[PDB]
Amino acid sequence: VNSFSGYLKLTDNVYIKNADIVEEAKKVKPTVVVNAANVYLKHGGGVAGALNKATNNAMQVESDDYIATNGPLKVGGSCVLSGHNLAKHCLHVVGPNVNKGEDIQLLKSAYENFNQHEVLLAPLLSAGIFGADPIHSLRVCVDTVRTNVYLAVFDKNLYDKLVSSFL
Numbered sequence: 001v002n003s004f005s006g007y008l009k010l011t012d013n014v015y016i017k018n019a020d021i022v023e024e025a026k027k028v029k030p031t032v033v034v035n036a037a038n039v040y041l042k043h044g045g046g047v048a049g050a051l052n053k054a055t056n057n058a059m060q061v062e063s064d065d066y067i068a069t070n071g072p073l074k075v076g077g078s079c080v081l082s083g084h085n086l087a088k089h090c091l092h093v094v095g096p097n098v099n100k101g102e103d104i105q106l107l108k109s110a111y112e113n114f115n116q117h118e119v120l121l122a123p124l125l126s127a128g129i130f131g132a133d134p135i136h137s138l139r140v141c142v143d144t145v146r147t148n149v150y151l152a153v154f155d156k157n158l159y160d161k162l163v164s165s166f167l
């Protein structure tokens with residue numbers, strides 16, 4: 001039993017809710033919140049800008065030190081950093097950005113990072129400003145992630161379409 005509330009169950013291990021991931025993180029304080037990161041960990045907008053703003057820019061300060069030491073992530077890759085006031089840990093995952101021309105096949109590699117964590121609160125990778133089809137992202141999530149994932153979808157209209165079209 002865990003503290004996630006109001007989710008629709010899609011499969012054995014995938015759950016979905018129309019929610020603001022920032023507000024959901026503030027309430028649940030999950031072990032892991034996933035960020036929709038880019039390779040530079042520049043958290044300017046989308047999910048990343050919102051999560052970083054909620055940490056009062058502490059996420060960005062930590063991220064800048066990470067990049068100065070380690071260099072950029074790979075598209076499809078991830079790193080574990082602090083969750084600050086939102087979660088124990090933040091898993092920064094880089095899905096392909098279609099608006100940069102990145103290969104959508106890398107979306108499966110991106111979701112594989114979730115399997116290193118037993119339970120996660122996450123957004124749909126490569127959705128939103130990353131330019132992928134969120135229906136496709138949900139399908140890849142369900143077919144790739146085997147650990148327990150609680151998906152927060154900010155847009156109510158999109159949430160209803162994702163549920164209604166789910167096979």
Ligand SMILES: OC[C@@H]1CCCN(c2ncnc3[nH]c4cc(F)ccc4c23)C1
Nearest residue numbers: 020021046047050123127128129152154
């Ligand atoms: O849904 C399409 C976009 C892009 C893909 C996923 N994004 C989110 N997903 C879950 N929670 C979210 N809180 C947010 C707060 C913001 F200021 C911006 C985006 C989100 C956000 C929204």
